[PDB]
Structure formats: C-alpha cells, structure tokens
C-alpha cells in the first residue's frame, strides 16, 4: 500500500546495509545471506524500491531506520506449529510508529498511526488462531514459577508433573491445562527502550494464548520486593490493550500514551 511495503529477508538485509542504519534487531532474526549487492538491485529498481539513480525510496528508508534505531519497541515472538518462523516488531523512533512483521522468508514493513492502545491489538494477535476470549475467574501465580513451568513443557515434561510443580488447584486445573496444551498458538510480547545511554528491556513479557478454552492473556505485575506476579485473565481486546499499555509503563520512559 501507500504506507506499507513487502520484501524478502535478503532484500531487507541489503537495504539495511546500503543505508547504514545498523543491523536488524535479533527478534526478527535477519541472517546475513558484491555478486549479490548489485544482483538484487535489479529487482529493487524494478519494484520501485530504488530509483534508476540507485537511491532508496525516501521513507522506505525511514522505516528501516526506525526499526533499526528504535527508541521504543515491542518484540513479538509468535509461535505456531514447528517449522514456522513468524516474528514481529512494533518500532517507534521520534514519533512515527513502524510495524515489522517477518513470515518465512518474507518481511512486511508498515507505518501506523498509533495514538490508541487498542490500535495495536490486531497486530499482536495476527499470528494466532482467532479464538474468542475465554471465560473464567482471574488467578495469579509467581511469574518465575510460570516461566519455569513453561520451559519444562517445551522440554517434554509430562503435563501432570508441571501442574503439581505449580500447585494448581482443581478450580483452575482445566484452565492451566489449556494454557500448556500442545495444540496452542501464542505470542510473547517484550517491551524495551533506549534512554540516558541505556538499553532497558522488560524482564517479564505479556503472553496472548489461543487455547481450547479460548484466548487467554497473561500479564505481569511487580511486587515491592521486586518479584513479579503473572495474572491469568480472559484475553479480550481491552485486557490486551491494557496489558501492553501497563507493560510499557513499567519502563523508565513510561507508557506510550
């Protein structure tokens, strides 16, 4: 579209190199692929990404630069079935917002006007299964315990052991089972910023999980002693937008709004 462009993973790297904006963030996992630099410039000039003068489109460039030199961002790790590498990133530099989304060996840079929290919800849930919000009473557990429990699931540990580790009561047992269900599709959201000569990233992220019970949101809250608490709640659009808004607020720069 007018404020969006689709590229290949190699074409993205090449553009980032000729502009000298630095390397892409690790979350996108852009791997290095002049028997190549000039070889693809025939495809870029064809697509109008670069003019016949070998100069990059003024703001296609600005988007790459925003993504590479971002002052505020959200790392998006989507997870489907194995063999899928869907990564995403919400980037802010100065005032413009840029959404980088990598699927397989394709990448889409999109400029967005994000004045609202809810404006992000479609992007965050893009790599999911489109489940409706689940219905249940909120419950909380140590964020460190939940992260450990999830690491054990991916390492092949039986479900029953993981539930005993967390000390899940029967009330929420059917519900935690759905969270760690193998037929799930989820996304982990991490916030970060650049300020005062520091790189500050969040310690605990926000998870949106599409389960057999429905869409579930997991958002953290810090206690006084510094230890985090993970709250499980129905993943409605308002809850998601709230969680991401609160996640960014935990950083020095404060909320994005």
- Distance CA(191)–CA(16), nearest Å, equals 23
Joined tokens for residue 116? 């609202």
Instruction: With CA atoms as reference, report the closest residue to 180 among 191, 168, 195, 190.
Output: 168
Structural domain harbouring 239 = 1-257
- Distance CA(220)–CA(173), nearest Å, equals 20
Instruction: With CA atoms as reference, report the closest residue to 6 among 78, 82, 60, 74.
Output: 60
Domain count, the chain: 1
Joined tokens for residue 70? 């971002």
Q: Residues near 224 by Cβ (< 8 Å), separated by ≥ 6?
A: none
Joined tokens for residue 132? 């409706």
- Distance CA(4)–CA(83), nearest Å, equals 26
Output the DSSP codes for 179-248: HT-TT-EEEEEEEEEEETTEEEE-SS-EEEEEETTEEEEEEEEE-SSS-EEEEEEE--HHHHHHHHHHHH
State the residue for tokens 């140590």. 142
Experimental method: X-ray
CB 191 within 8 A of CB 250: yes
Half-sphere exposure of 93 (CA within 13 A, CB side): 12
């Amino acid at each position: 579209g007018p404020n969006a462009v689709e590229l290949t993973t190699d074409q993205a790297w090449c553009l980032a190199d000729v502009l000298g904006a630095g390397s892409y963030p690790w979350v996108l996992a852009i791997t290095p692929p002049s028997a190549f630099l000039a070889a693809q410039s025939a495809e870029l000039t064809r697509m109008g990404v670069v003019n016949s003068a070998g100069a990059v489109d003024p703001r296609v460039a600005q988007w790459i630069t925003t993504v590479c030199r971002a002052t505020q961002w959200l790392d998006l790790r989507f997870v489907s079935g194995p063999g899928d590498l869907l990564r995403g990133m919400v980037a802010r530099r100065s005032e413009e917002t840029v959404v980088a989304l990598r699927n397989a060996q394709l990448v889409t840079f999109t400029a967005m006007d994000i004045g609202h929290q809810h404006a992000l919800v479609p992007v965050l849930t893009a790599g999911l299964s489109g489940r409706k919000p689940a219905r249940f009473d909120d419950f909380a557990l140590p964020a460190a315990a939940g992260a450990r429990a999830d690491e054990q699931i991916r390492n092949g540990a039986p479900l029953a052991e993981v539930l005993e580790f967390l000390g899940v009561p029967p009330s929420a047992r059917p519900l935690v089972e759905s969270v760690f269900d193998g037929r799930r599709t989820y996304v982990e959201i991490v916030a970060g910023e650049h300020r005062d000569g520091h790189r500050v990233t969040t310690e605990v992220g926000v998870s949106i999980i599409d389960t057999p019970h429905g869409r579930i949101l997991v958002h953290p809250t810090k206690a006084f002693d510094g230890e985090w608490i993970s709250t499980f709640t129905p993943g409605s659009a308002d809850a998601i937008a709230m969680a991401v808004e609160r996640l960014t607020a935990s950083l020095p720069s404060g909320s994005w709004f």
